[PDB]
């Protein structure tokens, strides 16, 4: 996250870290047994780390559970990043408490201008690399279709929304991928792609979760 702030410890209880020797992507807990992330974060073996704040130190509230099943969307397109969504089933249920909780799925898509909260442990520098140990937060609005499509001509599908600032300086970056965008208590976006990070006129592009509730539900019921 570029141009964010350090989140209060355990103030984003649905945030998870996907680990394969080290942190590589974020995710969101939507059920005690299921985590939603981005398909381009796919890896064969994944350990899901809940209850994290400082990923470099054991604090005592963590629950590390390995992924039992990893299901990428059947229509994910690696070229366009359409349908950039993946579901991970935990080998054992997470225990829900003050530090580990689920985030609601959207009841409807969000209005333009809706204030959201984005979080992750991705790169924090606009020039160079710097991965934080402490979870970062960023408040950003959902941009209209117009501003989103004018920013990326012919590259925005109906399964994508832009969230951020056209002036740059504030955005999600590498390492935040798969992470949550929560607006009014509902998971509206998944960190997906963009042209770089925090560049002017190039806001982050996110998977539009409100189109996938049926797929999520059907998949969880089937597995």
């Amino acid at each position: 996250i570029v141009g964010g702030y350090t989140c209060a410890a355990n103030s984003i209880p649905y945030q998870v870290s996907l680990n394969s020797g080290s942190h590589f992507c974020g995710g969101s807990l939507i059920n005690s047994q299921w985590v939603v992330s981005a398909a381009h974060c796919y890896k064969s073996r994944i350990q899901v780390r809940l209850g994290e704040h400082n990923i470099d130190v054991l604090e005592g509230n963590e629950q590390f559970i390995n992924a039992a099943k990893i299901i990428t969307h059947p229509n994910f397109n690696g070229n366009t990043l359409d349908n950039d969504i993946m579901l991970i089933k935990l080998s054992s249920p997470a225990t829900l408490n003050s530090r580990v909780a689920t985030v609601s799925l959207p009841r409807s898509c969000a209005a333009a201008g809706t204030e959201c909260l984005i979080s992750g442990w991705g790169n924090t520098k606009s020039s160079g690399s710097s991965y934080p140990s402490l979870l970062q937060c960023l408040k950003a609005p959902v941009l209209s279709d117009s501003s989103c499509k004018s920013s990326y001509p012919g590259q925005i599908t109906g399964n994508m929304i832009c969230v951020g600032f056209l002036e740059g300086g504030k955005d999600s970056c590498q390492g935040d991928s798969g992470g949550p965008v929560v607006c009014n208590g509902q998971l509206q976006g998944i960190v997906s792609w963009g042209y770089g990070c925090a560049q002017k006129n190039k806001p982050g592009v996110y998977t539009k979760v409100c189109n996938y509730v049926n797929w999520i539900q059907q998949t969880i019921a089937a597995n």
């Binding site: 350990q47 054991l58 963590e62 590390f64 559970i65 390995n66 039992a68 080998s91």
Partner: peptide, 7 residues
């Protein structure tokens, strides 16, 4: 660090 595999 802490918790293991299998799987």
């Amino acid at each position: 660090p802490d918790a293991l595999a299998l799987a």
